[PDB]
Motif scaffolding. Structure first.
Motif, PDB file in Angstrom:
ATOM      1  N   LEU A   4       0.765  -1.318   0.105  1.00  0.00           N
ATOM      2  CA  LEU A   4      -0.048   0.065   0.182  1.00  0.00           C
ATOM      3  C   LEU A   4       0.887   1.045  -0.041  1.00  0.00           C
ATOM      4  O   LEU A   4       0.664   2.134  -0.902  1.00  0.00           O
ATOM      5  N   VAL A   5       1.943   1.444   0.991  1.00  0.00           N
ATOM      6  CA  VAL A   5       2.860   2.576   0.915  1.00  0.00           C
ATOM      7  C   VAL A   5       3.356   2.564  -0.444  1.00  0.00           C
ATOM      8  O   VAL A   5       3.620   3.750  -0.669  1.00  0.00           O
ATOM      9  N   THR A   6       4.000   1.658  -0.953  1.00  0.00           N
ATOM     10  CA  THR A   6       4.849   1.538  -2.403  1.00  0.00           C
ATOM     11  C   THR A   6       3.835   2.158  -3.217  1.00  0.00           C
ATOM     12  O   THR A   6       4.178   3.212  -4.055  1.00  0.00           O
ATOM     13  N   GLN A   7       2.770   1.795  -3.519  1.00  0.00           N
ATOM     14  CA  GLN A   7       1.678   2.111  -4.377  1.00  0.00           C
ATOM     15  C   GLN A   7       1.230   3.704  -4.378  1.00  0.00           C
ATOM     16  O   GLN A   7       1.077   4.394  -5.160  1.00  0.00           O
ATOM     17  N   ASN A   8       1.162   3.980  -3.012  1.00  0.00           N
ATOM     18  CA  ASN A   8       0.685   5.283  -2.773  1.00  0.00           C
ATOM     19  C   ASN A   8       1.768   6.317  -2.902  1.00  0.00           C
ATOM     20  O   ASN A   8       1.631   7.543  -3.760  1.00  0.00           O
ATOM     21  N   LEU A  10       4.063   5.781  -5.438  1.00  0.00           N
ATOM     22  CA  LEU A  10       4.127   5.797  -6.823  1.00  0.00           C
ATOM     23  C   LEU A  10       2.657   6.829  -7.398  1.00  0.00           C
ATOM     24  O   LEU A  10       2.985   7.541  -8.373  1.00  0.00           O
ATOM     25  N   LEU A  11       1.518   6.693  -6.692  1.00  0.00           N
ATOM     26  CA  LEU A  11       0.687   7.451  -6.922  1.00  0.00           C
ATOM     27  C   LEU A  11       0.704   8.868  -6.881  1.00  0.00           C
ATOM     28  O   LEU A  11       0.244   9.826  -7.631  1.00  0.00           O
TER      29      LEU A  11
ATOM     30  N   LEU B   8       2.837   0.917 -12.654  1.00  0.00           N
ATOM     31  CA  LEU B   8       1.617   0.959 -11.696  1.00  0.00           C
ATOM     32  C   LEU B   8       0.628  -0.098 -12.055  1.00  0.00           C
ATOM     33  O   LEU B   8       0.183  -0.580 -11.013  1.00  0.00           O
TER      34      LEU B   8
ATOM     35  N   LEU C  10      -4.198   4.100   4.906  1.00  0.00           N
ATOM     36  CA  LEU C  10      -3.591   4.188   3.587  1.00  0.00           C
ATOM     37  C   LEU C  10      -4.497   3.648   2.356  1.00  0.00           C
ATOM     38  O   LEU C  10      -4.362   3.976   1.273  1.00  0.00           O
ATOM     39  N   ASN C  14      -4.978   5.799  -0.779  1.00  0.00           N
ATOM     40  CA  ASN C  14      -4.913   4.983  -2.065  1.00  0.00           C
ATOM     41  C   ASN C  14      -6.023   5.387  -2.893  1.00  0.00           C
ATOM     42  O   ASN C  14      -5.758   6.010  -3.982  1.00  0.00           O
ATOM     43  N   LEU C  17      -6.090   9.100  -4.099  1.00  0.00           N
ATOM     44  CA  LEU C  17      -4.867   9.369  -5.116  1.00  0.00           C
ATOM     45  C   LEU C  17      -5.338   8.715  -6.306  1.00  0.00           C
ATOM     46  O   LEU C  17      -4.783   9.558  -7.317  1.00  0.00           O
TER      47      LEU C  17
END
Lengths: 54, 299, 60
Positions: A4-8, A10-11, B8, C10, C14, C17
């Motif tokens: 989740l933190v990784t994708q956040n 990235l976003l 992504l 989170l 998510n 975003l």
């Protein structure tokens, strides 16, 4: 979890990149408006030249 | 070593690279493999951007590393392409992108197959093989797209040397039409042209579809040593020369031919026939100039 | 440790975003459409300039 933190992250980076691209497109539109105004002025100049025929 | 690059959308891609490699070259490799030009890429390691003038060793990128790739919405250069219908399309192009590439991109954005497209820029027609840099197509330039319907075909015509030209033709276009198109695009009189395909000469009376000529087909061109009409010219020194001409030729044409034969510039050429002057305007037909009739020059 | 609270925060970040990415892409597409229409206007003005120049050139 950590995904989740990784994708956040990235976003967030992607949001930043997209805003940059939008600003670049808007700058292009501003410059094209400058060119459009220059073309309008050129149309007026050529019309004032045409009037100087008869 | 080998590294991984993730998007992504979990599209992991493998890259065989060395730690002494720059980042712009990693982008070039991603372009080689996925077709994404480097200006639309953004590489990230441990949350930090990857600069083009920096190496992988500088970012402590070891074996089996995983970079993250974020694709942009635009690049550095775009062109506008306007259909005959009036719809304007934007294309993300590059100075190195050939016409084949922009035709493929038009296909991607509009479904129009590339074999039905011909692009016009400032009165010239773009040909596959050359880049936008060759045609001096700058950013935000507008290409007018037009469609070759009714059996539009690009054929190539190559001479015994290598001078290859491209012609727009239909299956119903006869060999005489093709020789006329060559005359219009290169100046060669059709009475001096001989067209060959698959090894046999092409008769004036048959069509391209009579010889089963299809798209992208290469016709070979052979130039005769002679035409149908020739005229004689006598120089001020008295030497005689022979010009391959046509009755539809203008005095400017025969003066250009004299310039080719004897190098004398056309302004110092005054032609005489039967005690008359030859105006630059009129043609050879208007002077009743028959085959093998001689002309005299002198200022 | 309260991992549920951080997990839900989170997940909310998510989804927010993702929505922001979607919105910014729509905005870029609108800006691009407006730029294309402005190029149409610019080309019309170029045609008008060409016509007026051809008229002026006819004056000898």
């Amino acid at each position: 979890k950590q995904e989740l933190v990784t994708q956040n992250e990235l976003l967030k980076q992607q949001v930043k990149i997209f805003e940059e691209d939008f600003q670049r497109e808007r700058s292009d539109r501003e410059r094209m408006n400058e060119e459009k105004e220059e073309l309008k002025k050129q149309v007026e100049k050529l019309q004032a030249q045409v009037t100087l025929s008869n | 070593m080998q590294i991984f690059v993730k998007t992504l959308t979990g599209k992991t891609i493998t890259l065989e690279v060395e730690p002494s490699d720059t980042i712009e070259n990693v982008k070039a490799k991603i372009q080689d493999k996925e077709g994404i030009p480097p200006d639309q890429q953004r590489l990230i390691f441990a949350g930090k951007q990857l600069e083009d003038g920096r190496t992988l060793s500088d970012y402590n990128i070891q074996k089996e590393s995983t970079l993250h790739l974020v694709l942009r919405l635009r690049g550095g250069m775009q062109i506008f392409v306007k259909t005959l219908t009036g719809k304007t399309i934007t294309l993300e192009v590059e100075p190195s992108d050939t016409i084949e590439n922009v035709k493929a991109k038009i296909q991607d954005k509009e479904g129009i197959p590339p074999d039905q497209q011909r692009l016009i820029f400032a009165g010239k027609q773009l040909e596959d093989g050359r880049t936008l840099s060759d045609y001096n197509i700058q950013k935000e330039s507008t290409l007018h797209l037009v469609l070759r319907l009714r059996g539009g075909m690009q054929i190539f015509v190559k001479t015994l040397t290598g001078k290859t030209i491209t012609l727009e033709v239909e299956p119903s276009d006869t060999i005489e039409n093709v020789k006329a198109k060559i005359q219009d695009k290169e100046g060669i009189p059709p009475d001096q042209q001989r067209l060959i395909f698959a090894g046999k000469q092409l008769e004036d009376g048959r069509t391209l579809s009579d010889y089963n000529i299809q798209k992208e087909s290469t016709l070979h061109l052979v130039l005769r040593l002679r035409g149908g009409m020739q005229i004689f010219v006598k120089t001020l020194t008295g030497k005689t020369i022979t010009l391959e001409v046509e009755p539809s030729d203008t005095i400017e044409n025969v003066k250009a031919k004299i310039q080719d034969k004897e190098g004398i510039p056309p302004d110092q050429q005054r032609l005489i026939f039967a005690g008359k002057q030859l105006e630059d305007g009129r043609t050879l037909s208007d002077y009743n100039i028959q085959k093998e009739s001689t002309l005299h020059l002198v200022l």
